[PDB]
């Protein structure tokens, strides 16, 4: 009895201390008489330190604590698809209980060195800028970093929406976000039909710190269930900065000595343990994969801060969203100079490699030249082959929210831009040209689209040039 | 009788109580092997290392794996010796973890093989060798301004995503494939993906026949990250001493060892240091570093990448590790953002080999002149930024003109970087680099555009690129 | 000569305006650096004080 | 015994770090930058033992040349400030002078000797 029943000694700020529980094991789940769950953190000589995973106002000194016999676990299964749950797996949307059968531990070892394979499969986000300049492969960890209100959430929503026709399972984890924004995100996902393959895990700002700390681990544990069955999973962590702040709060409530910016010493280990679980499994282990897109929020665009540098040293590349470009109407505001994909390149299809090879450096050169060109004389080559081409490139890469583009249409429009077919089109109507070209391709260019889809390679240049010229003849400049 | 009991479990730190008069020594290894008695327990196979003697027959240890599932009162067995790992020819071509257990799925190691403890005192003063010889790497900036020393200790400093891994891979490609000795790689605290790629690269190149690898990546608990470097060092020391052979030692990120020590230090009961680090930072780092030396019996040359947190070079961990190195390479984020790779700082990087009697008079003079021009260009930065180039004198204008060319010519195209850009890359001998920089300093190429000097290799390729550009 | 004098005065005016703009931008960046340094200093001081208090 | 001795301390900063380590391991309360409160007393009582004795004491002398390593040229740090206030002068070495071509990189403007003049021969004085 006493070996499985405890008594609370201290309660405060989500931290409890209990007497008894002789047979409790480290990391085990415990249950209070109030029904709130807790995690056994420290096993001292005469007492057990417990972290409360819920409202602690109902817990008073002298309350009963009982063992559960289970290490930290969350329910997993296909019945969890289309639902909104908390980090403990309890349903939140109010549509009834979840009929899962299996569970997975919160803490699990990452796949070993010999259990992995090089990334070789594209992840089509449906965004021209990302798919052209910063390709993402299945099994890659790609950081999305930017200031407040720079379009970070919109990129993830569009990426999730684009996975409708692909064998991909999406998991969206919102840490420290406002509940209204999560509600609207769920509504738009339902509107676009993404709930047929999406799991939403939410831990709002009003929730206690331990739930925010635990949410990403619950998400990755849910993803691993499909990952080890041979399937492909995409996991989005909407803010790792909120998790870092919550963990700092939890550590300082335990009186652990802080480091720089008051963060604890194991703040790097916190993120590394989570992000090492995304991998591309070898053929011997089923060939499944898990893709992670962590989010980091910067202050005044400072990429040299502690948390951004910690996350950058873990992932396989970063996508940088710039605030001034966003304010100037350039959306998405991807900074080509600072964005890079280490694993990408090998993930792109052959068609996209041919046309998008020089685009990164061309865009960077135009971006650095356009500031310098505000004064002095300019040579004809700079005016025509560089400034006009960069303006056309900037106009092409613009995109509207919640409107992903198929990869073949992106390849065709980028080929049209690169081969100079847009040089005589005025800058003011490049977007209308692009949309009318997309409309035209659906009727007269169907064979080119089918060839690109089937062979993943660019068609013959003669027929493509003929089709582009034929469309260009009927387009009106206005 | 060497049986103890678990008293406290606090993350990576576990307290064990032994019977009076039988306490294990410091650094001894303890084994916990528990079978689940019922459905409310889990199986445990865990190794602990003794750290402190707390008194009252209590010992505080550090766990080598996750402590989840531990229950107070479990039985602990003392092995009577520190962690021991296999050494010899059996380790060549294999991949090991921190405990010396192979992880390459090529089979187990026989139990009768020789094993050596991973803790030992550093070599004495009279056993050391101090000869200095140049190690050619084929990189222009390194060979010119801070030559590497054969048998010495080389450190690479940099922030996050600046290019330390690319540089060390290029060094492996240029040097290890024709070394003729033994190579050891220790991937402490880095990406598991990088370890998988490196293993396949070694297998394809065939270098793995003479290479031993011990990884212990960043997904491990802090206990494992504190000791894997010692395992790799023990394997290297065996070849240095018992066979008298030349050894290459690569350490992927030595800063993670200090970081793991800092993570463990707080739970051990030590009071925090200046920036939250452990009080014993310098002592621990010195104890690790002093074992990596060349002696009369054999030579070890080591290349270590050192992470700089938040790009702060005044951080205690990067600051204290400077005194242990013979040659240092400092990478800067500003140069990387400028597109200059390998982004080596030409003034912060130093080496003991840059002496007239070691590299020759001409090399020394050329390097010193290059550094002087770069220093003058750095001094003129505020004037250039505010008032522009118009107010400078004729002498300063020429200084800026040549400094731009010198700065761009220090960049190079790597063989490893071909996967990013598609450019094959080049290998430049030292004499060619010296001649090219001497010609640039003389004004022979003042008429060429400065963009022709980027990522070019030899000096003739500058002329070829300028001609192709239409000059 | 009169035309040259007028052009010289205009050029000097433009150069000084550009220099003032450059100085303003430099001040703008230095302010952010100053704010970061101030926050770091306050954090270090308060951490040291609290550690000294806890040591007793 | 009447002899003349020259003593060189290559790193006083490392001695200060070691003292801080052993003081923290003894659970003495830390000061600013985690250094113990009596860090100044250590160096002051170390460097006060160098002196020139009078004729009655034998006329012997002891000369000390302590070394301090700075971080990014910050001579306003704690240990440099403590040591500077003890000695009879400073010799400043700067990397910008070093790379500009002047070696040794002694900054003559900042360097000072408090007993200057008396420590020179007449020819050097002139
Ligand atoms: N491509 C786009 N075109 C037009 N509007 C866009 C685009 N991308 C984002 N927006 C708008 O920009 C605003 C902010 O975008 P978003 O909420 O995705 O950014 P965020 O960085 O996640 O913000 P927060 O910090 O508020 O969570 C929203 O009103 C969104 O509709
Ligand atoms: N010599 C080079 N040429 C081209 N690109 C480089 C070079 N060095 C580094 N890079 C770019 O910078 C990144 C280097 O990251 P990495 O070497 O992993 O940094 P770290 O090792 O410090 O984490 C790569 O993604 C690569 O695109
Ligand atoms: Mg958002
Ligand atoms: Mg690296």
Report DSSP letters for A164-225, one per residue.
Answer: GGTT-EEEEEEES--HHHHHHHHHHHHHTTGGGSEEEEEE-TTS-HHHHHHHHHHHHHHHHH
Q: Residue A441 has which token pair?
A: 């391709």
Per-position b or e across B235-261, b if 16+ CB within 10 A of its CB:
bbbbbbeeeebbbbbbbbbbbbbbbbb
A252 part of contact set with chain B, CB < 8 Å: no
Resolution in A: 2.6
Pick from A286, A378, A334: which is nearest to A135 by CA?
A: A334
Check whether residue B348 and residue B396 sit in a common domain. Answer: no
How close, in Å, is residue C51 to chain A by CA atoms?
Answer: 8
Chain D residue whose CA is closest to C51: D30
How many angstroms is it from C22 CA to the middle of ligand 4?
37
How many CB atoms sit inside 10 A of residue B206's CB? 10
Among protein residues, the one with the nearest Cα to ligand 1's atom 28 is A151
* Alpha-carbon gap, residue A275 to A272, rounded angstroms: 5
Angle at which helix B281-289 crosses helix B255-268, to 10 degrees, equals 140
At B134, give phi and psi (nearest 5°).
-80, 135
For ligand 2, what atom is nearest to the CA of residue B305? 21
How many CB atoms sit inside 10 A of residue D19's CB? 16
Per-position b or e across D6-16, b if 16+ CB within 10 A of its CB:
eeeeeebbebb
Domain of B279 in residue numbering reads as 84-352
Chain B residue whose CA is closest to A106: B68
Residue whose structure tokens are 């070892």: A109
- Determine the distance from the C-alpha atom of residue B399 to the mean position of all C-alpha atoms in its chain, rounded to a whole number: 36
Q: What single-letter DSSP state applies at residue A282?
A: -
* Alpha-carbon gap, residue A124 to A304, rounded angstroms: 30
In this structure, chain C runs to a length of 56
Angle at which helix A461-474 crosses helix A446-455, to 10 degrees, equals 140
* Alpha-carbon gap, residue B108 to B116, rounded angstroms: 17
* Alpha-carbon gap, residue A48 to A324, rounded angstroms: 51
- Give yes or no for a contact between B451 and A381, defined as CB atoms under 8 angstroms apart: no
Pick from A110, A161, A330, A294: which is nearest to A215 by CA?
A: A294
H or E element in which residue B229 lies: helix B228-242
Pick from B307, D56, B470, B446: which is nearest to A385 by CA?
A: B470
Any bridge partners for residue D65, and if so which? Answer: D8
Check whether residue B291 and residue B363 sit in a common domain. Answer: no
Check whether residue B367 and residue B444 sit in a common domain. Answer: yes
Question: Is residue A143 helix, strand or coil?
Answer: strand
Do A26 and B68 count as a contact with CB atoms less than 8 A apart?
A: yes
Instruction: Select from B47, B82, B117 the last residue of a domain.
Output: B82
Any bridge partners for residue B61, and if so which? Answer: B14, B50
Per-position b or e across A161-193, b if 16+ CB within 10 A of its CB:
bbbeeeebbbbbbbbbbeeeebeebbeebeebe
Q: Residue B391 has which token pair?
A: 């107010």
Q: How many CB pairs under 8 A join C and D?
A: 15
Instruction: Select from B352, B372, B407 the last residue of a domain.
Output: B352
Q: Given A342, A360, A419, A431, which residue is catalytic? A: A342
Whether there are 3 or more C-beta pairs closer than 8 Å between A and D is: no
Residue whose structure tokens are 């380790």: B91
Check whether residue B337 and residue B378 sit in a common domain. Answer: no
Residue whose structure tokens are 């004037």: B383
- Determine the distance from the C-alpha atom of residue A45 to the mean position of all C-alpha atoms in its chain, rounded to a whole number: 42
Q: Given B170, B190, B220, B237, which residue is catalytic? A: B190
Contacts of residue C47 in chain B, CB cutoff 8 Å?
276
Check whether residue B142 and residue B207 sit in a common domain. Answer: yes
How many angstroms is it from A150 CA to the middle of ligand 1?
6
Domain of residue A177, CATH code: 3.40.50.300
Angle at which helix B430-441 crosses helix B459-468, to 10 degrees, equals 60
Residues 6+ apart with CB under 8 A from A119: A137, A138, A139, A140, A280, A289, A343, A346, A347
Residue whose structure tokens are 């509504």: A187
Pick from A168, A82, A83: which is nearest to A125 by CA?
A: A168
Residue whose structure tokens are 């700075």: D70
What does A398-467 look like in DSSP terms, one character per residue? Answer: ---TT----HHHHHHHHHHHHTTTTTTS-GGGHHHHHHHHHHHHTTT-HHHHHHHHHHSS---HHHHHHH
∠ CA D36-C36-A312, nearest 5°, is 100
B438 is annotated as an active-site residue: no
- Give yes or no for a contact between A92 and A84, defined as CB atoms under 8 angstroms apart: yes
Longest dimension (CA), chain D: 57
Q: What domain count does chain B have?
A: 3
For ligand 2, what atom is nearest to the CA of residue B307? 22
* Alpha-carbon gap, residue A119 to B193, rounded angstroms: 10
* Alpha-carbon gap, residue A191 to A382, rounded angstroms: 46
Mutate to test the interface with B, among A107, A313, A341, A360 (most CBs of B within 10 A): A313
Contacts of residue B272 in chain C, CB cutoff 8 Å?
51
- Give yes or no for a contact between B457 and B410, defined as CB atoms under 8 angstroms apart: no
What is the tally of helices (H) and strands (E) in chain B? 16, 18
Characterize the bridge pairing of strands A5-12 and A64-71. antiparallel
How many angstroms is it from A314 CA to the middle of ligand 4?
9
Alpha-carbon distance values, D67 to A369, B313, D13, D72, D92 (Å) = 50, 21, 8, 16, 11
How many CB atoms sit inside 10 A of residue A238's CB? 27
Q: What single-letter DSSP state applies at residue A93?
A: S
Check whether residue B293 and residue B188 sit in a common domain. Answer: yes
Q: Which protein residues are within 6 Å of ligand 2, measured from CB?
A: A 313, 340, 342; B 158, 160-166, 341-342, 414, 417, 420
Any bridge partners for residue A198, and if so which? Answer: A170
Q: Residue A121 has which token pair?
A: 């499969």
Check whether residue B76 and residue B107 sit in a common domain. Answer: no
At B160, give phi and psi (nearest 5°).
-85, 125
Residues 6+ apart with CB under 8 A from D31: C48, C52, D37, D39
Cis peptide bond upstream of A332, omega within 30: yes
Q: Residue A475 has which token pair?
A: 């387009």
Pick from A129, A161, A158, A173: which is nearest to A294 by CA?
A: A173
Check whether residue B156 and residue B253 sit in a common domain. Answer: yes
Alpha-carbon distance values, B126 to B130, B174, B289 (Å) = 11, 33, 18
Do C43 and A255 count as a contact with CB atoms less than 8 A apart?
A: no
* Alpha-carbon gap, residue B331 to B325, rounded angstroms: 16
D72 burial level (CB within 10 Å; 0-12, 13-18, 19+): exposed
Check whether residue B137 and residue B208 sit in a common domain. Answer: yes
Pick from A110, A130, A145, A343: which is nearest to A240 by CA?
A: A145
Q: Residue A30 has which token pair?
A: 């415990």
* Alpha-carbon gap, residue B412 to B457, rounded angstroms: 6
D41 part of contact set with chain B, CB < 8 Å: no
Instruction: Select from B41, B57, B82 the last residue of a domain.
Output: B82
A255 part of contact set with chain B, CB < 8 Å: no
Q: How many CB pairs under 8 A join A and B?
A: 138
Q: Residue A81 has which token pair?
A: 């698809």
What is the tally of helices (H) and strands (E) in chain C? 1, 0
How many CB atoms sit inside 10 A of residue A218's CB? 26
Q: What single-letter DSSP state applies at residue A280?
A: B
How many CB atoms sit inside 10 A of residue C16's CB? 11
* Alpha-carbon gap, residue A239 to A246, rounded angstroms: 11
Characterize the bridge pairing of strands A198-203 and B134-135. unpaired
Cis peptide bond upstream of D104, omega within 30: yes
∠ CA A162-A167-A170, nearest 5°, is 60
* Alpha-carbon gap, residue B424 to A81, rounded angstroms: 48
Domain of A248 in residue numbering reads as 75-352
* Alpha-carbon gap, residue A364 to A345, rounded angstroms: 18
How many angstroms is it from A384 CA to the middle of ligand 3?
39
Long-range CB contacts (< 8 A, 24+ apart) of D81-88? Answer: D82/D39, D82/D40, D82/D43, D83/D12, D83/D43, D86/D43, D86/D44, D86/D47, D87/D47, D88/D113, D88/D114, D88/D115
C47 part of contact set with chain A, CB < 8 Å: yes
Q: Residue D59 has which token pair?
A: 């006329």
Question: Is residue B24 helix, strand or coil?
Answer: coil
Check whether residue B186 and residue B265 sit in a common domain. Answer: yes
What does B94-115 look like in DSSP terms, one character per residue? Answer: -EE-TTS-B-SSS-PPPTTS-E
For ligand 2, what atom is nearest to the CA of residue B158? 22
Alpha-carbon distance values, A21 to B353, C5, C31 (Å) = 64, 94, 55
For ligand 1, what atom is nearest to the CA of residue A238? 22
* Alpha-carbon gap, residue C56 to D22, rounded angstroms: 17
Check whether residue B297 and residue B431 sit in a common domain. Answer: no
Pick from A434, A429, A445, A405: which is nearest to A478 by CA?
A: A429
Of the CA atoms within 13 Å of residue D102, those in its CB half-sphere come to 10
Chain C residue whose CA is closest to D34: C48
How many CB atoms sit inside 10 A of residue A325's CB? 17
* Alpha-carbon gap, residue D34 to B280, rounded angstroms: 13
Check whether residue B317 and residue B399 sit in a common domain. Answer: no
- Give yes or no for a contact between B323 and B174, defined as CB atoms under 8 angstroms apart: no
How many CB atoms sit inside 10 A of residue B410's CB? 25
At B182, give phi and psi (nearest 5°).
-105, 145
Contacts of residue C18 in chain B, CB cutoff 8 Å?
388
Question: Is residue A102 helix, strand or coil?
Answer: strand
* Alpha-carbon gap, residue C31 to A367, rounded angstroms: 26
Contacts of residue A256 in chain B, CB cutoff 8 Å?
266
Among A142, A275, A340, say which to mutate for ligand 2: greatest number of ligand atoms within 8 Å of CB. Answer: A340
* Alpha-carbon gap, residue A20 to A7, rounded angstroms: 7
CA dihedral B125, B127, B133, B137 (to 10 degrees): -90
- Give yes or no for a contact between B246 and B182, defined as CB atoms under 8 angstroms apart: yes
- Give yes or no for a contact between A352 and A134, defined as CB atoms under 8 angstroms apart: no
* Alpha-carbon gap, residue B99 to B104, rounded angstroms: 14
Pick from A414, A467, A477: which is nearest to A442 by CA?
A: A467
Characterize the bridge pairing of strands B247-251 and B300-307. parallel
How many angstroms is it from B136 CA to the middle of ligand 2?
22
Mutate to test the interface with C, among A248, A252, A261, A303 (most CBs of C within 10 A): A261
Among A304, A309, A341, A342, say which to mutate for ligand 2: greatest number of ligand atoms within 8 Å of CB. Answer: A342
């Amino acid at each position: 009895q006493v070996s499985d029943v405890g008594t609370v000694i201290q309660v405060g700020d989500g931290i409890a201390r209990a007497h008894g529980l002789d047979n409790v094991m480290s990391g085990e789940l415990v249950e209070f008489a109030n029904g709130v769950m807790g995690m056994a953190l420290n096993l001292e000589e005469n007492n057990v330190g417990i972290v409360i995973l819920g409202p602690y106002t109902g817990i008073k000194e002298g309350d009963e604590v009982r063992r559960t016999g289970r290490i930290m676990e969350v329910p997993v299964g296909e019945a969890l698809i289309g639902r909104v749950v908390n980090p403990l797996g309890q349903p939140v949307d109010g549509l009834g209980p979840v009929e899962t059968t299996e569970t997975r531990p919160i803490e699990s070892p990452a796949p070993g060195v010999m259990d992995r394979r090089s990334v070789h499969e594209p992840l089509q986000t449906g965004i021209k800028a990302i798919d052209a300049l910063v390709p993402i492969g299945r099994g890659q960890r790609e950081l999305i970093i930017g200031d407040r209100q720079t379009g970070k959430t919109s990129v993830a929503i569009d990426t999730i929406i684009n996975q409708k026709d692909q064998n991909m399972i999406s998991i969206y984890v919102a840490i420290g976000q406002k509940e209204s924004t999560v509600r609207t995100v769920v509504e738009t996902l339902r509107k676009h039909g993404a709930l047929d393959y999406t799991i939403v895990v939410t831990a709002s700002a009003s929730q206690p710190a331990p739930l925010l700390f635990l949410a990403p681990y619950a998400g990755v544990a849910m993803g691993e269930y499909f990952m080890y069955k041979g399937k492909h999973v995409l996991v989005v962590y909407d803010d790792l900065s909120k998790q870092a702040a919550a963990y700092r709060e939890l550590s300082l409530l335990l009186r652990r000595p802080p480091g720089r910016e008051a963060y604890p010493g194991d703040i790097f280990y916190l993120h590394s343990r989570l992000l090492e679980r995304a991998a591309k499994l070898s053929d011997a282990k089923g060939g499944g994969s898990l893709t992670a897109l962590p989010f980091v929020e910067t202050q005044a665009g400072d990429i040299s801060a502690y948390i951004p540098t910690n996350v950058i040293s873990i992932t396989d590349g970063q996508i940088f969203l710039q605030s001034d470009l966003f304010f100037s109407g350039v959306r998405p505001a991807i900074n080509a100079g600072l964005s890079v994909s280490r694993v990408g390149g090998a993930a792109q299809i052959k068609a996209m490699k041919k046309v998008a090879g020089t685009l990164r450096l061309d865009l960077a050169a135009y971006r650095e030249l356009e500031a310098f060109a505000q004064f002095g004389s300019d040579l004809d080559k700079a005016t025509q082959a560089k400034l006009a081409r960069g303006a056309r490139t900037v106009e092409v890469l613009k995109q509207d929210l919640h409107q992903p583009i198929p990869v073949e249409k992106q390849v065709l429009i980028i080929y049209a831009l690169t081969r100079g077919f847009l040089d005589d089109i005025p800058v003011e109507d490049v977007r209308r040209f692009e949309k009318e070209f997309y409309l035209f391709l659906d009727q007269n260019g169907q064979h080119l689209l089918e060839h690109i889809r089937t062979t993943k390679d660019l068609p013959n240049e003669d027929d493509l040039n003929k089709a582009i010229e034929a469309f260009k003849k009927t387009f009106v400049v206005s | 009788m060497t049986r103890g009991r678990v008293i406290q479990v606090m993350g990576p730190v576990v307290d064990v109580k032994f019977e009076n008069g039988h306490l294990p020594a410091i650094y001894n290894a303890l084994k916990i092997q528990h079978k689940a008695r019922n459905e409310n327990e889990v199986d445990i196979d865990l190794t602990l290392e003794v750290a402190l003697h707390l008194g009252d027959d209590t010992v505080r240890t550090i766990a080598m794996a996750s402590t989840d599932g531990l229950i107070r009162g479990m039985e602990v067995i003392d092995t009577g010796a520190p962690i021991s790992v296999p050494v010899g020819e059996v380790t060549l071509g294999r991949v090991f973890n921190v405990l010396g257990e192979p992880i390459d799925l090529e089979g187990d190691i026989p139990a009768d093989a020789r094993r050596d403890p991973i803790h030992r005192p550093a070599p004495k003063f009279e056993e050391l060798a101090t000869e200095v010889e140049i190690l050619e790497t084929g990189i222009k900036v390194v060979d010119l301004l801070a030559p590497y020393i054969k048998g010495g200790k080389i450190g690479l400093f940099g922030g996050a995503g600046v290019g330390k891994t690319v540089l060390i891979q290029e060094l492996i490609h240029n040097i290890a494939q024709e070394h003729g000795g033994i190579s050891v790689f220790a991937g402490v605290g880095e990406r598991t993906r990088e370890g998988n790629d490196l293993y396949h690269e070694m297998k394809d190149s065939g270098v793995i026949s003479k290479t031993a690898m011990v990884f212990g990546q960043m997904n491990e608990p802090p206990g494992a990250r504190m000791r894997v470097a010692l395992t790799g060092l023990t394997m290297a020391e065996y070849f240095r001493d018992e066979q008298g052979q030349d050894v290459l030692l690569f350490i992927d990120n030595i800063f993670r060892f200090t970081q793991a020590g800092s993570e463990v230090s707080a739970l051990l009961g030590r009071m925090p240091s200046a920036v939250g680090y452990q009080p014993t930072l310098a002592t621990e780092m010195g104890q690790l570093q002093e074992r990596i030396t060349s002696t009369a019996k054999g030579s070890i040359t080591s290349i270590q990448a050192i992470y700089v947190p938040a790009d702060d070079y005044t951080d205690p961990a990067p600051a204290t590790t400077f005194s242990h190195l013979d040659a240092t390479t400092n990478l800067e984020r500003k140069l990387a953002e400028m597109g200059i790779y390998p982004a080596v700082d030409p003034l912060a990087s130093t080496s003991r080999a840059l002496a007239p009697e070691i590299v020759g008079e001409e090399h020394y003079q050329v390097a010193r002149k290059v550094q002087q021009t770069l220093q003058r260009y750095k001094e003129l930065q505020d004037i250039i930024a505010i008032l522009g180039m118009d107010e400078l004198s004729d002498e300063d204008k020429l200084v800026v003109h040549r400094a731009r060319r010198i700065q761009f010519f220090l960049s190079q195209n790597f063989h490893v970087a071909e996967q990013f850009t598609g450019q094959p890359g080049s290998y430049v001998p030292v004499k060619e680099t010296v001649r090219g920089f001497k010609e640039i300093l003389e004004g022979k190429y003042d008429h060429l555009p400065e963009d022709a000097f980027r990522l070019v290799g030899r000096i003739e390729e500058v002329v070829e690129k300028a001609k192709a550009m239409g000059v | 000569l009169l035309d040259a004098k007028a052009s010289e005065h205009a050029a000097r005016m433009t150069a000084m305006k550009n220099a003032t703009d450059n100085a303003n931008e430099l001040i703008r960046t230095l302010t952010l650096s100053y704010n970061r340094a101030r926050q770091a200093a306050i954090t270090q001081e308060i951490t040291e004080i609290v550690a000294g208090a806890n040591a007793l």
